[PDB]
Design a protein around this ligand. Structure first.
Ligand SMILES: OC[C@H]1O[C@H](O[C@H]2[C@H](O)[C@@H](O)[C@H](O)O[C@@H]2CO)[C@H](O)[C@@H](O)[C@@H]1O
Ligand SMILES: OC[C@H]1O[C@H](O[C@H]2[C@H](O)[C@@H](O)[C@H](O)O[C@@H]2CO)[C@H](O)[C@@H](O)[C@@H]1O
Ligand code: CA
Length: 516
């Protein structure tokens, strides 16, 4: 893996449940059979959306956690674990949405102003989730829902492995910048969603709070605004994305725009920890979308990410760290294109996020953006997961593998693996001062024969006078590997003579010993 390391010891595979209720797509008895089959194929837990529109449908504090508890019982019956997603977002309207579960309609009556929803540059209204700006309502409702859900799930704390929060559209922490109705779907540039009267006033007061007065604002932006009401978000989104973003105004607007998402993260994180920590003691996570299109566009750089709220990934990730939330990223199955008209750089995106997460000590998890029907995609997911220190991978979605034995088996082989610690010992390595030893092998867990950035580093054991290392390998999988020396300057000096193999890697810890 990157930086002489191996696969993450805590790696786990998860499976996404259907979008609809089990009773609609199947029956409880069969569901339990499925869960046992999934487990048989390396899946540790099943992630599931518990829709806000279902749990507090009729009115404020009129909860219905019956489905959730029933679901939990079957998971317990199957001998599995579950990862619930408190979905405070709408089901239906996004890609792959075979459902229609809006958020509680009575919530929109709480406010008389447009503070609860989103409005695009062109006036397209979005209501598939609450606008992070209405923190007062978010605090009341999410606090109430998180606490209520905790109480109802208390009896099943044993089958709950982790809890996901919903940061916005599709359960991701972002703005609804890419929708068909707004005409901003992939691979188009996104539109900013801060055009409600409420959003305008918040930005204005935020700016005035930072500078104090219009005189100091104009002095900082090098502008000539006559009135405070002139302080407004980008009237021309494309122009802003072309060069407007480079100005002091641009920096300020993007700071606020993204800041709203960072504060949201710290809020829902605080409420979540307060609600679940004492009872469950499990990690809580949230998701960051994979806005890979218009990434390397020359005229409008990151033209889709910015309107979604993603301007400074490093700054965004600090919010997760402080809120004590694990991060989940998607697009692990895709590869870079970076060509007109899409300018799609998914792989590059993932690598950057992973590197940032890893340097910040944030636990990282991944998902596939779209359904997979070929082992090739699984292979890509494997390269990223095992080489970029991902703590877990969640397959989207249930039906894809549950009703296809061939695809299910390939998933088992490549991704449904159990990481086991093993000691690799190499004897008689003709090293010179400055020489470092490494091993690389066929599987993605061993760096896929890469010698540049994915090899696993070995160290010299002065007591036994050899090179060895505690490497984490996939249990019960056949592997082929070879040791090699790297000169001080970072170039391959030589390779071990005979190719080594372990058919298969033992489930129990031991050591593979070979000579140069
Ligand atoms: O709030 C002041 C004005 O901001 C925007 O204008 C920006 C423009 O969006 C940006 O691309 C350019 O670089 O800077 C100007 C301001 O200097 C709004 O479009 C204006 O209506 C506001 O008055
Ligand atoms: O079941 C979890 C969520 O699944 C969908 O959202 C996915 C989307 O389909 C996928 O392309 C993208 O990469 O990730 C998101 C989030 O995992 C549903 O649309 C959501 O409503 C569900 O919460
Ligand atoms: Ca409530």
């Amino acid at each position: 893996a990157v930086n002489g390391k191996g696969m993450n010891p805590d790696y786990k595979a998860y499976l996404m449940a259907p979008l609809k209720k089990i009773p609609e797509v199947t029956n409880w008895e069969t569901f339990e059979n499925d869960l046992r089959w999934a487990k048989q194929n390396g899946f540790y837990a099943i992630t599931v959306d518990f829709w806000w529109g279902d749990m507090e449908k009729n009115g404020d504090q009129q909860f219905d956690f019956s489905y959730a508890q029933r679901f939990a019982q079957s998971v317990k019956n199957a001998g599995m674990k579950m990862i619930p997603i408190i979905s405070t977002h709408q089901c239906g309207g996004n890609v792959g949405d075979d459902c229609n579960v809006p958020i509680p309609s009575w919530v929109w009556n709480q406010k008389s102003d447009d503070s609860l929803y989103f409005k695009s540059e062109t006036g397209t209204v979005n209501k598939e989730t609450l606008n992070p700006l209405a923190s007062d309502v978010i605090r009341k409702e999410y606090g109430e829902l998180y606490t209520a859900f905790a109480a109802a799930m208390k009896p099943y704390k044993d089958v709950i492995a982790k809890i996901y929060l919903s940061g916005g559209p599709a359960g991701e922490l972002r703005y609804p910048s890419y929708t068909t109705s707004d005409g901003t779907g992939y691979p188009s540039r996104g539109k900013f969603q801060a055009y409600t009267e409420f959003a305008k006033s918040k930005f204005r007061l935020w700016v005035l709070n930072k500078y104090g007065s219009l005189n100091e604002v104009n002095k900082a932006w090098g502008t000539k605004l006559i009135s405070e009401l002139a302080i407004l978000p980008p009237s021309d989104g494309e122009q802003f994305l072309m060069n407007g973003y480079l100005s002091m105004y641009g920096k300020d607007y993007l700071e606020w725009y993204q800041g709203i998402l960072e504060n949201h993260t710290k809020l829902i994180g605080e409420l979540a920890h307060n609600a679940f920590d004492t009872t469950f003691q499990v990690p809580i996570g949230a998701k960051i979308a994979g806005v890979h299109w218009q990434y390397n566009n020359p005229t409008i750089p990151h033209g889709a990410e910015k309107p979604a709220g993603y301007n400074d990934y490093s700054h965004l990730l600090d919010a997760f760290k402080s809120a004590k939330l694990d991060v989940t990223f998607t697009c692990l199955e895709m590869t870079d294109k970076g060509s007109y008209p899409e300018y799609s750089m998914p792989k590059t995106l993932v690598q950057n996020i992973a590197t940032l997460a890893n340097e910040k000590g944030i636990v990282l998890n991944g998902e596939n953006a779209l359904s997979i029907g070929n082992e090739e995609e699984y292979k890509r997911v494997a390269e990223m997961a095992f080489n970029y220190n991902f703590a877990g991978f969640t397959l989207l979605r249930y039906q894809d593998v549950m009703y296809n034995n061939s695809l299910m088996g390939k998933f088992k082989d490549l991704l449904g693996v159990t990481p086991v610690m093993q000691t690799i010992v190499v004897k008689n390595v003709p090293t010179t001062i400055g020489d470092t030893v490494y091993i690389t092998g066929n599987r993605a867990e061993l760096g896929s024969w890469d010698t540049k950035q994915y090899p696993i580093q070995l160290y010299y054991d002065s007591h036994s006078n050899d090179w060895r290392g505690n490497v984490v390998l996939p249990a019960e999988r056949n592997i082929e590997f070879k040791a090699f020396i790297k000169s001080k300057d970072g170039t391959v000096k030589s390779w071990q003579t005979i190719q080594q193999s372990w058919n298969p890697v033992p489930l129990k810890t031991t050591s593979h010993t070979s000579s140069w």
